């Protein structure tokens, strides 16, 4: 299994560097979880960058990757709250909290790009 943050989709969809390594990752393991709120953060970022045609492509990616949009359950929100005093502000954002949450709870590794999300309690995807 895996978790994909907003950083690795906003990346891919924008064809930032090493987007193909993120594709191989998406390919390498079959079930791909994503937090309804990471998806939402991703949905806003895309649709301001590229308008609604951005959103089509976002929507196609998610259906063709067979993504399971997982609900932000209370237990996830408590791990983030808990973990923020140590790893929040480098740092860790409010937006990041839902990827952390899902990961810490689901126990699965996390696909991402950028400084934050290094040096936290959960696994990083190679």
């Amino acid at each position: 299994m895996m978790v994909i943050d907003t950083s690795a989709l906003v990346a891919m969809l924008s064809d930032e560097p090493d987007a193909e390594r993120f594709e191989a990752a998406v390919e390498a393991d079959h079930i791909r979880l994503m937090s309804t709120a990471s998806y939402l953060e991703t949905a806003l970022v895309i649709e301001a960058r590229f308008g609604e045609p951005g959103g089509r492509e976002l929507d196609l990616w998610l259906h063709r990757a067979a993504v399971d949009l997982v609900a932000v359950h209370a237990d996830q929100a408590d791990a983030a709250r808990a973990a923020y005093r140590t790893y929040g502000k480098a740092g860790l954002n409010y937006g990041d909290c839902f990827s952390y949450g899902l990961a810490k709870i689901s126990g699965q590794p996390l696909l991402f790009k950028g400084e934050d999300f290094q040096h936290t309690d959960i696994a990083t995807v190679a």
Binding site: E23, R49, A65
Partner: protein
């Protein structure tokens, strides 16, 4: 074959015109 599609989507999505180029942070309402 999965890889093709996410490249096709990426290339196809990446080639859209940039209607706002502001920072991710700022378009989420966190820049006043």
């Amino acid at each position: 074959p999965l890889r093709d599609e996410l490249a096709a989507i990426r290339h196809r999505c990446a080639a859209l015109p940039v209607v706002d180029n502001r920072s991710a942070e700022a378009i989420l309402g966190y820049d006043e």
